[PDB]
């Protein structure tokens, strides 16, 4: 089980001015440290950020948390479960400011909601610092869903926090699941006049606005300004980031159908539309050396129990992932880049059930 703290620094908060915190469970003979972001969609305005507090709560306030969690997946502490980081300092940072990670905004006269997404996470690392984060060696921060975007948003700026703190040998290191998204087009269009029918690259881009956010420097300054919601796009950002970031992507990913307005007998011009999506995430990650791209239809996550189940060319994830760690003291028959090439979901016979 992992043990809730809540923050020291109650002016870091969640969405309704609550503290924000962490869920730790110490492993005192390793030197690596799991930094783990929830994930779960975002709000961006009054109207749709209201109606998340009333039926999603605990995704915006930490009043309701329990003691603690139970580590699970790549979060667990049994070799049996999880083959690649079993022995390492595991910690669950719970997302309660549905702004991808990426806010920097506190609740005031002017805002009902705060938004700290990108505060929260410089907070936890340097709190943990006293709790033995200072004599690490590997810094992994990882997150499913809005919290591999958060991973993206973010890695760059943990180790630029530790370098300015005088941690420089401290290895820091991302990995990103399900949060590598397309601005695509729909396979049926909507105008934004409603929260059920604006586009992401639209949603993001009042959600900078209504969260103050902040986004990694180099692709701010490709983008600049009213053009930053371009870096909340896996491939878009990624070659702005200098720490060394592992991808994980389902080739449909069902949060991505979702937002392409894609609810599933096919007929032609929707297996055209879903064949043509495979192939064009397939092709961002042409440059991406470490990744791991099933082809498969999904919402599954690498902190479920059985994460160890889906190979890709007979490869699991826990050795991709630990092909990854000897990449960074090619390698024979430990490989780091693996996407799926064939082109229907559920085509790798390994696929979540
Ligand atoms: O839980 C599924 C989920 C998906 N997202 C998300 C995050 C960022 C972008 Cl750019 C898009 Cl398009 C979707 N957030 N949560
Ligand atoms: C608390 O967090 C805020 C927001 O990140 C920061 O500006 C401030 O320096 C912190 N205060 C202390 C005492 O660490």
Redesign the pocket.
Known sequence: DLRLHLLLNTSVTCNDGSPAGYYLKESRGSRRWLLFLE????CFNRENCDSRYDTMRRLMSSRDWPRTRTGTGILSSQPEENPYWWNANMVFIPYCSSD?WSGASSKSEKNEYAFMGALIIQEVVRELLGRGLSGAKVLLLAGS??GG?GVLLNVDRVAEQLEKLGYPAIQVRGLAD??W?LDNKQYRHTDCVDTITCA?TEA?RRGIRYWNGVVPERCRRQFQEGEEWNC??GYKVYPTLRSPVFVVQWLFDE??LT?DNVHLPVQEGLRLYIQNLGRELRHTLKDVPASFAPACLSHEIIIRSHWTDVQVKGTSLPRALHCWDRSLHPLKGCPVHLVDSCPWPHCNPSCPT
């Open positions: 994930g779960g969609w975002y991808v869903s809005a975007t399900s949060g998204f992401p993001i909340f796009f949060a991505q937002v």
